[PDB]
Write an enzyme that holds these catalytic residues in place. Sequence first.
Site, PDB file in Angstrom:
ATOM      1  N   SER A  42       0.869  -1.186   0.000  1.00  0.00           N
ATOM      2  CA  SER A  42       0.000   0.000   0.000  1.00  0.00           C
ATOM      3  C   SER A  42       0.904   1.234   0.000  1.00  0.00           C
ATOM      4  O   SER A  42       0.427   2.368   0.013  1.00  0.00           O
ATOM      5  CB  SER A  42      -0.887   0.016   1.246  1.00  0.00           C
ATOM      6  OG  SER A  42      -2.106  -0.690   0.976  1.00  0.00           O
ATOM      7  N   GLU A 140      -5.025  -3.179  -6.896  1.00  0.00           N
ATOM      8  CA  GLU A 140      -5.588  -4.037  -5.839  1.00  0.00           C
ATOM      9  C   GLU A 140      -6.632  -5.037  -6.384  1.00  0.00           C
ATOM     10  O   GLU A 140      -7.412  -4.654  -7.256  1.00  0.00           O
ATOM     11  CB  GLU A 140      -6.293  -3.161  -4.802  1.00  0.00           C
ATOM     12  CG  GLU A 140      -5.387  -2.205  -4.060  1.00  0.00           C
ATOM     13  CD  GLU A 140      -4.773  -2.830  -2.812  1.00  0.00           C
ATOM     14  OE1 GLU A 140      -4.727  -4.070  -2.705  1.00  0.00           O
ATOM     15  OE2 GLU A 140      -4.338  -2.074  -1.934  1.00  0.00           O
ATOM     16  N   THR A 209       1.685   3.035   5.447  1.00  0.00           N
ATOM     17  CA  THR A 209       2.060   1.634   5.639  1.00  0.00           C
ATOM     18  C   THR A 209       1.825   0.812   4.362  1.00  0.00           C
ATOM     19  O   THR A 209       1.151   1.257   3.428  1.00  0.00           O
ATOM     20  CB  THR A 209       1.194   1.026   6.760  1.00  0.00           C
ATOM     21  OG1 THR A 209      -0.186   1.176   6.399  1.00  0.00           O
ATOM     22  CG2 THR A 209       1.464   1.735   8.131  1.00  0.00           C
ATOM     23  N   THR A 211       1.031  -3.604   3.621  1.00  0.00           N
ATOM     24  CA  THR A 211       0.986  -4.990   4.114  1.00  0.00           C
ATOM     25  C   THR A 211       0.640  -5.903   2.919  1.00  0.00           C
ATOM     26  O   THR A 211      -0.065  -5.504   2.011  1.00  0.00           O
ATOM     27  CB  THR A 211      -0.039  -5.119   5.270  1.00  0.00           C
ATOM     28  OG1 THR A 211       0.265  -4.137   6.288  1.00  0.00           O
ATOM     29  CG2 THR A 211      -0.046  -6.514   5.879  1.00  0.00           C
TER      30      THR A 211
HETATM   31  C1  ISS Z   1      -1.970  -1.991   1.351  1.00  0.00           C
HETATM   32  O1  ISS Z   1      -0.881  -2.397   1.751  1.00  0.00           O
HETATM   33  C2  ISS Z   1      -3.174  -2.931   1.270  1.00  0.00           C
HETATM   34  C3  ISS Z   1      -2.771  -4.368   1.606  1.00  0.00           C
HETATM   35  N1  ISS Z   1      -3.929  -5.256   1.435  1.00  0.00           N
HETATM   36  C4  ISS Z   1      -3.528  -6.645   1.704  1.00  0.00           C
HETATM   37  C5  ISS Z   1      -3.346  -6.840   3.211  1.00  0.00           C
HETATM   38  O2  ISS Z   1      -3.285  -5.868   3.962  1.00  0.00           O
HETATM   39  C6  ISS Z   1      -3.244  -8.260   3.771  1.00  0.00           C
HETATM   40  C7  ISS Z   1      -2.297  -9.086   2.899  1.00  0.00           C
HETATM   41  O3  ISS Z   1      -2.036  -8.742   1.810  1.00  0.00           O
END
Ligand code: ISS
Length: 265
Positions: A42, A140, A209, A211
Site C-alpha cells: 500500500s 488491488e 504503511t 501490508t
Molecule cells: C496496502 O498495503 C493494502 C494491503 N492489502 C492486503 C493486506 O493488507 C493483507 C495481505 O495482503
Amino acid sequence: DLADRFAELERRYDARLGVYVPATGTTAAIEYRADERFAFCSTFKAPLVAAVLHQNPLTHLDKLITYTSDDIRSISPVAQQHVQTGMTIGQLCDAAIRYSDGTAANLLLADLGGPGGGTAAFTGYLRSLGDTVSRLDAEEPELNRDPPGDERDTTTPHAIALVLQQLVLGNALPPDKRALLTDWMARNTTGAKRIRAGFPADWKVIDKTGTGDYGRANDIAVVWSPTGVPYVVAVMSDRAGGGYDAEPREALLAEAATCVAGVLA
Ligand SMILES: *C(=O)/C=C/NCC(=O)CCO
C-alpha cells in the site's frame, strides 16, 4: 552496531528487512538491504495521491466519483461505506492514505488514467522524480501477491525514501498540494505500531504503511525531531520463509524504527 542489530531482527522474525534513511546535513545515510526490491504493497498510495494532486487543479478534489459492487475487490474500510453515494477525489485520497483503502486506490489509478488502468502513469510519475527503479504493474488486490523475488510491483527502501523526500520535504509538489499530502499522512490511522512506535512522542511522525502476502509489512515515514529537523525513514520487510500465508509482523518495523531513532536522537 546498526547492521548487527538489523541482522538480529531478521533472525528473530525469520524475515528479510530493508531500511533506508537519506543522508542529511550531519547524518550519514542509514542503509540495510536498501537497494533490494520489496513489494510496494500500500506504500504506493502516498505517491499515487501526489500523482493525482500534481496532475489536476486543486478543486479536482471536489469531483464526485461513483462506483459499484464489482469495484470492491480488496480491503476498503471507507469505500465499502460510501458505495451508495460515491466519494469525491478528496475523499478517495483521504481513504487511500489514512485507511490504506484499496478501492480508493484503484479509483485513483483510473482517475490518473492511461494503460494498465493508470499503473503506467503512476510509474511515469515516479520516473519524473528520478526514480528509475520502482514499478507498478497491477492494482488491488493483485499488487500485494507477487512471489518473493518477482520484480513486479516493487520498489526499494532507497528509491521510495528519495521519492518521499521530494514529495514531503522537497519541491515535487506546490506548497498547497504538498500540505494536503503531508496532512493526510500525518493523520494516518494504520501506522501506530510501526515507525511511530519506534520514535519518542515528542517527534512528529507522518507515514503510509503497506501490508501484503508472504509476511510483507512496510512503512514509509517522514519524522521531525523535537527541534524540527526532518528525516525520511523507509522500512520494508517480508517473511518469504513462511510462504504465502506468512503473518506480517509489525513489531519488526517497530524494532527497526527504534534502532533508527536511537541513531538519529
Ligand atoms: C496496502 O498495503 C493494502 C494491503 N492489502 C492486503 C493486506 O493488507 C493483507 C495481505 O495482503
